[PDB]
Design a protein around this ligand. Structure first.
Ligand SMILES: [Zn+2]
Ligand SMILES: [Zn+2]
Ligand SMILES: [Zn+2]
Lengths: 114, 114, 114
């Protein structure tokens, strides 16, 4: 699984340990080993949500499987929780795009996961 | 809808008001309420288009519906127009990836749109 | 075709000429003319892969066609090889998401490729 958060929150407002917390929480949520989880945070972005530049986040989660209606609801509660608690972003100013990837469409280690 | 533009144009060349212009015109073109429109501009990028580092842009528009052949042509005319007039990027140096998202695959406000 | 690499490797570690090498080799791998290839490198990112922040990369390749199991394996070998040799990133710390785009879903030059 791989998760990106793009936000207008400043870099200094991202806590030490946030990447490790996302890794652990996503490992637990997806059930995948942490060794397979990648995370990426991009602060200081020029962005707006509903025309407003109050704190917001635009995110992506790519995973080979572990994507679906109930799972994505659970991930959204989890991830919005973390962004609210750690980055002080309101849940209603977060979007997360979920992409279920075929194994043949994810490259890694000189080949794909197929 | 969520629109991202990645460009090698420098930050100082992005005019004041541009996020607001994008929000307004995307709301009108997609028919979606402005509250649901998110926009993100990423200047100063290390990029090439056709092997050239002349001004260019690589973009993404995700939307739950309102994506299809005729709509996408319309969006491209609108967005390339804006990038040309505001950022001085030639339309033939812009790519826009359009993604029609299932409601169940978009997280927002602790849940999804499904 | 368009290729993005997000990495924690610093900007100064990206060698001169790398965008040009990526353009050339992607043109050859996809079979598409270099004039149609776009490349984007994003260094200095706040990322982790498998819980750690040694050099890693999260990438995307979007292409109208030229995507499939054998092609993607060949792209992955090529791209991991380049990231290892030029950016000193281990291949087992690289993910590449491959997206086959419909022509009507790629905007360019005020219209789409349809
Ligand atoms: Zn997406
Ligand atoms: Zn895409
Ligand atoms: Zn993707």
């Amino acid at each position: 699984p791989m998760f990106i958060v793009n936000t207008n929150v400043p870099r200094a407002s991202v806590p030490d340990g946030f990447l490790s917390e996302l890794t652990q929480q996503l490992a637990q949520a997806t059930g995948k080993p942490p060794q397979y989880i990648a995370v990426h945070v991009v602060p200081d972005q020029l962005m707006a949500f509903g025309g407003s530049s109050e704190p917001c986040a635009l995110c992506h989660l790519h995973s080979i499987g572990k994507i679906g209606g109930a799972q994505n609801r659970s991930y959204s509660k989890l991830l919005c929780g973390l962004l609210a608690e750690r980055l002080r972003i309101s849940p209603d100013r977060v979007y997360i795009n979920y992409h279920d990837m075929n194994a043949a469409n994810v490259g890694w280690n000189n080949s794909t996961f197929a």
